[PDB]
Amino acid sequence: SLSKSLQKPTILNVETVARSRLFTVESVDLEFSNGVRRVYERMRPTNREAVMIVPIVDDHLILIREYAVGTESYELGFSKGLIDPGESVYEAANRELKEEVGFGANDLTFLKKLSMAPSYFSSKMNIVVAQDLYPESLEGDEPEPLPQVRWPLAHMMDLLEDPDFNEARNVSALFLVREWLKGQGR
Amino acid sequence: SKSLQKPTILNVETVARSRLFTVESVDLEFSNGVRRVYERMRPTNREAVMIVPIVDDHLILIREYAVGTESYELGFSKGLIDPGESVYEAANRELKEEVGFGANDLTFLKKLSMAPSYFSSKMNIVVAQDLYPESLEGDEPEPLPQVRWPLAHMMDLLEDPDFNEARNVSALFLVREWLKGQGRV
């Protein structure tokens, strides 16, 4: 038969089937274009977005060490947080830097927006590069201080040899910033 | 300056369960005495695999429905590694189920975590070459349209929002780096 365009399935029903303090899982009844019915599960859709900041000062990246309960270990990577309602990406980035690393930035650049496993989650991550930093601290919600790690741009790619850093958002960010740095040749 | 001391886990408790999700509440005591109750997805040892097939200087991508964003993604074939399978074996089987091809040359490029703050799952990236026809039945509810994308313009994928997902992006850049190594550019 004739090749045809994509046709999204119709959502027959959506029901909350489990809720924790931070998670709300929904059961979604679907009917695909070919009439096949299936029940999928996903995290309740939200429009709350995240921001990840990549600070560069004196030819070094500023990374942080942060506990992750999912793996029960310390990850090495870029500062991340949520964009509060009403805030632009630049504003959330500046606020998160101040709260996590004690600096604000006069030069913030929005490089890319990414989704993460959209089959189950609808969250987006905005990658921002921060330069021309100045000291300024804000109170965050971290239970413990976030140790900072200065990493030379010239050896940026060595971060891929550290399993504590090898997380999809960190790796995507690393390569996107390097591409951007090439643009201006710095 | 003091060394890193992981918080101590005082208590773990299942607090919600769905068909595919089991959320745990974790009581923590950081080394500075601060106490917090974090929530996470029950830790698992099960791993995923993602395959990047290359044929005649082109990437083979697939379009697949994602209920979380209620849209069609454009990207690499992904699946779960079955217990007892190596990454190579899982990659070959998934290729077969999803694109109808097996591969004689499979290379394991990288292993990545995904939001370790709440999940503990790993994603293995495998490049597949020297393909041959061979189908296996998967459990997909509808066919997965295939899209051929030239290696010479692989970075243009970053201009398609249907493709811009952290795992696809990481794999794209890692495969490009690897291609450079064989002068495939």
Curated annotation (Swiss-Prot), chain A:
Q: Does the keyword Cell membrane apply?
A: no
An individual GO BP term: nucleoside phosphate metabolic process
Indicate which residues form the motif Nudix box. 81-102
Q: Which InterPro entries match?
A: NUDIX_hydrolase-like_dom_sf, NUDIX_hydrolase_CS, NUDIX_hydrolase_dom
Cofactor binding: number and manner: Mg(2+). Other divalent cations can also be used.
UniProt binding sites for substrate: E41, S119
- All residue ranges annotated as the Nudix hydrolase domain in the record: 46-173
Q: Which GO terms describe its molecular function?
A: ADP-ribose diphosphatase activity; ADP-sugar diphosphatase activity; magnesium ion binding; protein homodimerization activity
Q: Which cofactor does it need?
A: Mg(2+)
PROSITE patterns membership: NUDIX, NUDIX_BOX
Against Pfam families, the record matches this protein to:
NUDIX
The role this protein plays is: Active on adenosine(5')triphospho(5')adenosine (Ap3A), ADP-ribose, NADH, adenosine(5')diphospho(5')adenosine (Ap2A).
**Family classification:** Belongs to the Nudix hydrolase family.
The entry's protein name is: ADP compounds hydrolase NudE
**What organism is the protein native to?**
Escherichia coli (strain K12)
What is the name of the gene encoding this protein? nudE
UniProtKB/Swiss-Prot annotation, chain B:
Catalytic activity line of the entry: ADP-D-ribose + H2O = D-ribose 5-phosphate + AMP + 2 H(+)
The cofactors named for this UniProt entry are: Mg(2+)
Q: Where is this motif: Nudix box?
A: 79-100
Q: Provide the Gene Ontology terms for cellular component.
A: cytosol
Q: Which residues bind a divalent metal cation?
A: E94, E98
Biological process GO annotation list? nucleoside phosphate metabolic process; ribose phosphate metabolic process
Database matches in Gene3D superfamilies: Nucleoside Triphosphate Pyrophosphohydrolase
The note describing how and how many cofactors are bound reads: Mg(2+). Other divalent cations can also be used.
* InterPro entries per UniProt: NUDIX_hydrolase-like_dom_sf, NUDIX_hydrolase_CS, NUDIX_hydrolase_dom
> Which EC number applies?
3.6.1.-
Kindly list the positions annotated as binding substrate: E39, S117
What terms describe the molecular function in GO for this protein?
A: ADP-ribose diphosphatase activity; ADP-sugar diphosphatase activity; magnesium ion binding; protein homodimerization activity
Q: One Pfam annotation, family name? A: NUDIX
Keywords, in A-Z order:
Hydrolase, Magnesium, Metal-binding
**Which family, according to the similarity comment?**
Belongs to the Nudix hydrolase family.
| Subunit (UniProt) | Homodimer.
Question: Which NCBIfam families does the UniProt record give?
Answer: PRK11762.1
The protein's name in its UniProt record: ADP compounds hydrolase NudE
| Gene that produces this protein | nudE
